[PDB]
Amino acid sequence: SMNPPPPETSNPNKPKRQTNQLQYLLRVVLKTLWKHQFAWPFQQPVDAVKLNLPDYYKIIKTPMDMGTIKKRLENNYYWNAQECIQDFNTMFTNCYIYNKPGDDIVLMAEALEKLFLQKINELPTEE
Ligand SMILES: COC(=O)C1(NCC(=O)Nc2nnc(C)s2)CC(C)(C)OC(C)(C)C1
Known part of the structure; x- marks a missing residue:
């Protein structure tokens, strides 16, 4: 079976705004998770064809x-x-749905989720 197309990422017809929270989510939250040693399985859509x-x-x-x-x-x-x-x-x-409690990949996702929550804790007041 095939992979689906990736999720939509750009819609020029949508209205656009910059906020402190969105800037933080990119420059701090995404950045921190991206550079984590457990990030690699989560940096792109799951390729079910390549991974069988x-x-x-x-x-x-x-x-x-x-x-x-x-x-x-x-x-x-x-x-x-x-x-x-x-x-x-x-x-x-x-990740939790596809896999099972205690799986290595699940433990990886759990760690990333914990880090995410620590970073979201300091989300700036929308100002
Ligand atoms: C766990 O991830 C992986 O690295 C592996 N593939 C399955 C997979 O990708 N599962 C995901 N579940 N949520 C994600 C987000 S990725 C794991 C095993 C089976 C040990 O060996 C290969 C090489 C195929 C890589």
Whole structure:
């Protein structure tokens, strides 16, 4: 079975705004998670063809990854910070859904989620 197209990352017809929270999500949150030693499985869409995971997109119907999130932030695809936070949570929960408690990849995602939560804790007041 085939991979789906990646999630939409750019829509020129959407209204655009810069906020302190969106800037922080790109320059601090995404940046920190991206450079983490456990980031690599999450830096691009899961390639189920290359990885021989034929059931991945039978199970995961809302794919999300940090490559997509980076693109959405840098193309001003998000209007509300919560949209971006939701995408990070989708990425983590997808990993938990496809895999099982205690799997190495799950432990990796858990660590990244903990780091994410520490970084989101210091999200600036929308100002
Ligand atoms: C865990 O990830 C991986 O690196 C591996 N593939 C499965 C996979 O990618 N699962 C994902 N679940 N959520 C993601 C986001 S990635 C794991 C094993 C099976 C040990 O060996 C290969 C080489 C195929 C790489």
